[PDB]
């Protein structure tokens, strides 16, 4: 073991794709990553937001993540946390940084649809005509992948579709108006914003990365 990943503040991994049934097993979502980071001295905490839908609102994932962060802070004696979120988890992490800036040291987003997902939009459109969405091979293959990533459920079809509602262009548009961040570039520019942000009297380090395996071709 060593101290390569031994940050000053605890690291909270925040999943995005989750089921609608609270307390599902999320230990393998960040596959092999918790043990790797622990071997390098990190204090890793994996949030479980399964059972909560949207990020904002009194019973959204944001208030749940905030409560989890306060629990980690009360237990450790630490004053702040580093939030690393994947997919929706990046939006959930932004909620906590906005409503409780003094508890956050950094926000890192991985594959987060800050401006929405065109696949979520496509599914919204298809559901107006086929409410199950299973007539579409592309939707059915996604549903099956979702099912394999999360713990067993009798209702994978429903949960996989539910997972995309928060990620539409329209939903995320409202979210960004409600929860602005200097980390976001101007709408329609396809550019990032600032590397840091001052929210209360707190400075936040802001980061992100994404994958571009799927490229457009003429054929």
């Amino acid at each position: 073991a060593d101290t390569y990943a031994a940050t000053r503040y605890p690291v909270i991994l925040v999943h995005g794709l989750a089921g609608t049934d609270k307390f599902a097993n999320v230990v393998d979502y960040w596959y092999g990553i918790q043990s790797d980071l622990q071997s390098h001295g990190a204090k890793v905490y994996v949030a479980n937001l399964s059972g909560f839908q949207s990020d904002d609102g009194p019973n959204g994932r944001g208030e749940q993540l905030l409560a989890y962060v306060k629990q980690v802070l009360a237990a450790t004696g630490a004053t702040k946390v580093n939030l690393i979120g994947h997919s929706q988890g990046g939006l959930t992490s932004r909620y906590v940084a906005a409503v409780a800036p003094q508890l956050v040291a950094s926000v890192t987003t991985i594959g987060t649809p800050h401006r929405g997902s065109e696949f979520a939009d496509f599914v919204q459109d298809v559901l107006k005509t086929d409410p199950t969405g299973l007539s579409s091979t592309v939707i059915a293959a996604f549903v099956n992948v979702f099912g394999t990533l999360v713990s067993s459920s009798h209702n994978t079809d429903q949960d996989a579709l539910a997972a995309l509602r928060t990620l539409t262009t329209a939903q995320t548009a409202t979210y960004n108006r409600n929860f602005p961040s200097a980390g976001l570039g101007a709408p329609g520019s396809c550019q990032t914003g600032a590397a840091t942000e001052t929210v209360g009297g707190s400075q936040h380090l802001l980061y992100s990365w994404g994958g571009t395996a799927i490229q457009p071709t003429s054929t």
Binding site: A5, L37, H40, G111, T148, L205, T212, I214
Partner: protein, 97 residues
């Protein structure tokens, strides 16, 4: 698939067999491209992912590769996501957080 290609995989890539999310995410990513998303990971476009200091958007990854998924299977051209996250945690450490 029409209108898109998956750069994470090489010729006769076993990831197309053992991890069903590889081809599924190419199909969802093609739907996104027909909706003006541009390059993407299957669920999220490069443009939509941009926030704060962008370390990179050039990884040859689909959405599940980012979390070393399914069960750590990734195409032949995909970078190691475990090492990428590890490097970032050290980055945070060296930034004083």
């Amino acid at each position: 698939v029409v209108g898109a290609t998956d750069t994470s995989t090489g010729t006769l890539d076993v990831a197309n067999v053992t991890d069903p999310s590889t081809l599924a995410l190419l199909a969802t990513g093609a739907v996104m491209i027909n909706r003006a998303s541009g390059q993407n990971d299957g669920l999220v476009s490069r443009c939509s992912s941009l926030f704060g200091q962008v370390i990179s958007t050039s990884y040859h990854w689909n959405h599940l590769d980012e979390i070393n998924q399914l069960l750590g299977v990734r195409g032949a051209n995909a970078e190691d996501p475990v090492a990428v996250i590890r490097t970032h945690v050290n980055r945070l450490k060296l930034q004083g957080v």
